[PDB]
């Protein structure tokens, strides 16, 4: 038996969930279609200093554009990523709804909040406004699915929480689809700096 975890990937339509999960090439080539739920389960293997860990990532077929997801989608999830789009404020405004829907079925499973599309110049949801994770004591990351920026961070955090090893490391990155856009290094440094500064501040 392999060490594997059901990871539900939820968030508004158009936030980039499919693109993000698809970055992992073997997860895409070996994905399993669940017809009863209209789901694609991507097996994303990561190699840690203590062996392999597989996140079976559940990706919708777009149903979230028309309403909430059925119980079966969330059932027996062991972790989750909630994604929004930093170029669309309303996707961040819906984050509490996704969190509530998720905890209603799965309760207090480890969860990572991700703000996608940070490669885009005109960023609407800046670090100072991103506060929901601090209210629920969750981990947050900026990501860019199209540039692989920070792709591994949510999965490393989740692995550390699930295994109970804060020193767990990925000894090598998974094979990922080549970046379709460039993430300016200085822009990434600036956004990470803004994030830590925002962490200094307190939440009104």
């Amino acid at each position: 038996p392999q060490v594997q975890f059901k990871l539900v990937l939820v968030g508004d339509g158009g936030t980039g969930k499919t693109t993000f999960v698809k970055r992992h090439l073997t997860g895409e080539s070996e994905k399993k279609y669940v017809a009863t739920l209209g789901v694609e389960v991507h097996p994303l293997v990561f190699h840690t200093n203590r062996g392999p860990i597989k996140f079976n990532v559940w990706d919708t077929a777009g149903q979230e554009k028309f309403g909430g997801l059925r119980d079966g989608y969330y059932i027996q999830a062991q972790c989750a990523i909630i994604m929004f789009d930093v170029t669309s404020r309303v996707t961040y405004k819906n984050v509490p709804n996704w969190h509530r829907d998720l905890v209603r079925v799965c309760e207090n499973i480890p969860i990572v909040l991700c703000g996608n599309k940070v490669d885009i110049k005109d960023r609407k949801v800046k670090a100072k406004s991103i506060v929901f994770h601090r209210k629920k004591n969750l981990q947050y990351y900026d990501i860019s699915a199209k540039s692989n920026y920070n792709f591994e961070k949510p999965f490393l955090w989740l692995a550390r929480k699930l295994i109970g090893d804060p020193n767990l490391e990925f000894v090598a990155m998974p094979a990922l689809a080549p970046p379709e856009v460039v993430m300016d290094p200085a822009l990434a440094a600036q956004y990470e700096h803004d994030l830590e500064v925002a962490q200094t501040t307190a939440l009104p």
Binding site: P1, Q2, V3, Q4, K6, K32, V34, T36, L37, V39, V41, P43, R50, G51, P52, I53, N56, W58, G72, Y73, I75, Q76, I163, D165
Partner: protein, 38 residues
């Protein structure tokens, strides 16, 4: 110490072949996707 060495599946558990969720022995169908125990 590798966590894969000490990892054991629960007695009677079966992995769903359609969606990979771990199910209980007394569950004839997958609790997540309703696919039938192989």
């Amino acid at each position: 110490s590798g966590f894969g060495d000490k990892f054991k599946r629960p007695v009677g558990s079966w992995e769903c072949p359609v969606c990979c969720v771990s199910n209980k022995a007394e569950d004839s169908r997958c609790v997540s996707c309703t696919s039938e125990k192989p």
